[PDB]
Write a protein that binds this ligand. Structure first.
Ligand SMILES: NC(=O)c1ccc[n+]([C@@H]2O[C@H](COP(=O)([O-])OP(=O)(O)OC[C@H]3O[C@@H](n4cnc5c(N)ncnc54)[C@H](O)[C@@H]3O)[C@@H](O)[C@H]2O)c1
Ligand SMILES: NC(=O)c1ccc[n+]([C@@H]2O[C@H](COP(=O)([O-])OP(=O)(O)OC[C@H]3O[C@@H](n4cnc5c(N)ncnc54)[C@H](O)[C@@H]3O)[C@@H](O)[C@H]2O)c1
Ligand SMILES: Cc1cc(C(N)=O)ccc1-n1c(CCC(=O)O)ccc1-c1ccc(-n2ccnc2)cc1
Ligand SMILES: Cc1cc(C(N)=O)ccc1-n1c(CCC(=O)O)ccc1-c1ccc(-n2ccnc2)cc1
Ligand SMILES: [K+]
Ligand SMILES: [K+]
Ligand SMILES: [Zn+2]
Ligand SMILES: [Zn+2]
Ligand SMILES: [Zn+2]
Ligand SMILES: [Zn+2]
Lengths: 372, 373
């Protein structure tokens, strides 16, 4: 395999638009896979890292972690994947061998986390160069490029008939929200639910709640424009905290004769995380933190809330063991068990990638799919 | 029932003062009430919390006590499942069997009588206690610091009539709570690695539960090293003192378990330690159970990263036991030697020495002191 010259959206520094550049992509080393990215989407954390607020965000970097494509080539020792395979790259890998992969209670494979956090392949180097400069990887995926290189354990092999301009969304938001409901919460039929934040993650939670047979699904958002789509996904009603003088947890307790069976925070706001917990019913209430708060911020409550029977938990990528689960999720979409198309609110070409960031900031999008 | 009973009780006349052995009057039970002759009672931390005046819900004068065992003296109108002579433990968490909570297998927090109970009253909104012309309040629905108490009929567990009441009184709170925290709330699997913060009666019962469930490691944590010997006797595989280390206790535990424990239990009531107990749990699957009851208004905190990376924060009340059905089963486990009770009794006193039990509790020298009425 040879060096590939191709287009990528490079973030040279924080707080600036992405630069469409000509880059070089090195061939895959041992146990690496080079992927032709066919479609990618833009998510909140891409923007967060780009802003410079991320304490562990480093530049220059090729962002992007919601993608789908085709294996261009594989490195030495790779036998399970081959050129032509249809794939989704994974920011949570599955080595299948570490104590985390071997434990049915978690999906947090630890094999490559240190190098990945530093924007590096497992051997401690990057495959990206541009204008004489090394360009860092992001979240083990770097999908904002015509070609990326990932660890061989960061790859889900999927249905070759899957529409890649849709299933790229199973790389993050949809899988996370859906899994929060069905894996982390494991909510029972008839459950009363509250979902805080009605972006793609929140909608996917609602979707999961409906699949699980929830009786009541209350969407909560400060942006009432989000309500229509939430109802389409199955929210039985929607409320705006701004419309009430009382704290949102008191409103929810009032509405539900004690609080919800399950709540989901899909914002990353620590005050709302507390509200979501306190909005849960005494005795059996469970709150799942899905939102990723800014570093240093703390969640708080009175321990009485736990002693009186509420449970606080969280989720990472919906708890899915990624390599085994993502193909199954693609199969659920193909069989119309779950929705994917309904999350796509905008479509752009690669050169227009910055407009996807603009759409996010405005609050006008769920997911924008960028066609490479 | 029958008539008014004139007996002795330990009255708390006022916050911040010792208990006074007074001559009191105990009214006969009304409909769906049960009058119990208390044979043995013990003193628990929350009795002192209320006595101190620090409890915003504490009201005086009051007859305290909620760990007790006795014999039914008489029953009110409409009571059929209990009769004079039945061997019983009074329950601060009742089980009406009919409310939303009783009907839900995930909880034991019966709500049937909680409002009146919170006010120190029977379900009809009145007290059965008087002393020197004054109304004396009930406490935790139990008021065990009396020769005779009256409780709601849903606040009674009928137990093995061969059970020694100077031992099984302890199943009315501490032992049951700790044991249940392990086997009910955590439901730990065989082979689990556990940490127990606080090595009083509650912590010891957690250790007992972890051993019953087949934990591979049980790490006891206490700033009082005098607690270590009994903790090991109960099944602690090792014991550590936070004061012996320069770094936070959660870092210490992560180091000794290669990532953190599978299950942690806070058995103190300290919000800083509660955070530490959560953070000492293993990434991905760790579970921390809050058992300690913190002072009012105090808050627990952590970074949400701790939950997003797979730790779970829970709590428990009376070990999650649906009380009326479970406490007799817990007595049976004691009688069959599946669980320990006798080993929790470190001191024994007479009723007129009840204040010494409080002294022993605050000096750190006791686990449980049983007071013989
Ligand atoms: N845990 C994981 O594995 C994981 C995976 C993907 C995304 N996330 C996180 O999930 C969160 C949501 O992602 P998204 O793509 O849906 O974002 P989004 O911006 O599209 O949606 C967030 C929504 O929250 C609403 N909101 C903001 N403040 C609110 C408040 N005070 N009360 C009620 N609603 C409020 C906004 O109006 C918005 O609609 C982000 O924090 C993201 O980082 C976590
Ligand atoms: N949740 C419930 O239903 C329930 C039921 C019974 C008791 N409790 C609570 O459980 C807690 C413990 O009860 P107990 O009877 O065992 O009390 P205890 O006072 O006998 O035991 C507490 C132990 O914690 C230790 N300790 C104090 N600070 C510490 C620290 N910083 N680090 C490590 N250890 C520390 C003390 O040395 C003591 O041995 C109390 O708060 C009590 O109210 C709760
Ligand atoms: C999965 C992940 C990747 C990175 C990274 N930079 O590669 C940083 C944090 C996380 N991360 C971890 C740590 C995983 C571990 O330690 O094994 C737990 C949860 C996350 C995580 C962080 C962010 C998101 N996220 C938010 C929006 N889109 C994806 C999803 C998951
Ligand atoms: C069970 C109990 C009794 C009283 C009371 N004073 O009667 C107050 C709080 C609680 N309580 C509640 C009630 C909340 C509710 O049901 O809505 C939940 C948990 C408790 C509770 C309070 C204190 C203790 N405790 C601490 C030490 N010994 C017993 C154990 C449990
Ligand atoms: K569940
Ligand atoms: K368990
Ligand atoms: Zn994302
Ligand atoms: Zn692994
Ligand atoms: Zn009830
Ligand atoms: Zn107690």
């Amino acid at each position: 395999n040879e060096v590939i010259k191709c287009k990528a959206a490079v973030a040279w520094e924080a707080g600036k638009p992405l630069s469409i550049e000509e880059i070089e992509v090195a061939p895959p080393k041992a146990h690496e896979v080079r992927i032709k990215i066919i479609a990618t989407a833009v998510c909140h954390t891409d923007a967060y890292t780009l802003s410079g607020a991320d304490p562990e965000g480093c530049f220059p970097v090729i962002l992007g972690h919601e993608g789908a494509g085709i294996v261009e080539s594989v490195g030495e020792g790779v036998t399970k994947l081959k050129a032509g395979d249809t794939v989704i790259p994974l920011y949570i890998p599955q080595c299948g061998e570490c104590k985390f992969c071997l434990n049915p209670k978690t999906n947090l494979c630890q094999k490559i986390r240190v190098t990945q956090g530093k924007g590096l392949m497992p051997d401690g180097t990057s495959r990206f160069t541009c204008k004489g400069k090394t360009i860092l990887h992001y979240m083990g995926t770097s999908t904002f490029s015509e070609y990326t290189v990932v660890a061989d354990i960061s790859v889900a092999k999927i249905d070759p008939l899957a529409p890649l301009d849709k299933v790229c969304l199973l790389g993050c938001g949809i899988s996370t929200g859906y899994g929060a409901a069905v894996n982390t919460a494991k909510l029972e039929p008839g459950s009363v639910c509250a979902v805080f934040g009605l972006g793609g993650v929140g909608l996917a939670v609602i979707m999961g709640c409906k699949v699980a047979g929830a009786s009541r699904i209350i969407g909560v958002d400060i942006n009432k424009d989000k309500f229509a789509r939430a109802k389409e996904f199955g929210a039985t009603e929607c409320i705006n905290p701004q419309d009430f003088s009382k704290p949102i947890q008191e409103v929810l307790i009032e509405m539900t004769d004690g609080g919800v069976d399950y709540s989901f925070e899909c914002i990353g706001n620590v005050k709302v995380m507390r509200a979501a917990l306190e909005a849960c019913h005494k005795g059996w209430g469970v709150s799942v933190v899905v939102g990723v708060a800014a570093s240093g911020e703390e969640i708080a409550t009175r321990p009485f809330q736990l002693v009186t029977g509420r449970t606080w938990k969280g989720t990472a990528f919906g708890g899915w063991k990624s390599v085994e689960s993502v193909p199954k999720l693609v199969s659920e979409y193909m069989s119309k068990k779950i929705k994917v198309d309904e999350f796509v609110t905008h479509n752009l070409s690669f050169d227009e990638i910055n407009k996807a960031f603009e759409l996010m900031h405005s609050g006008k999008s769920i997911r924008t799919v960028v066609k490479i």
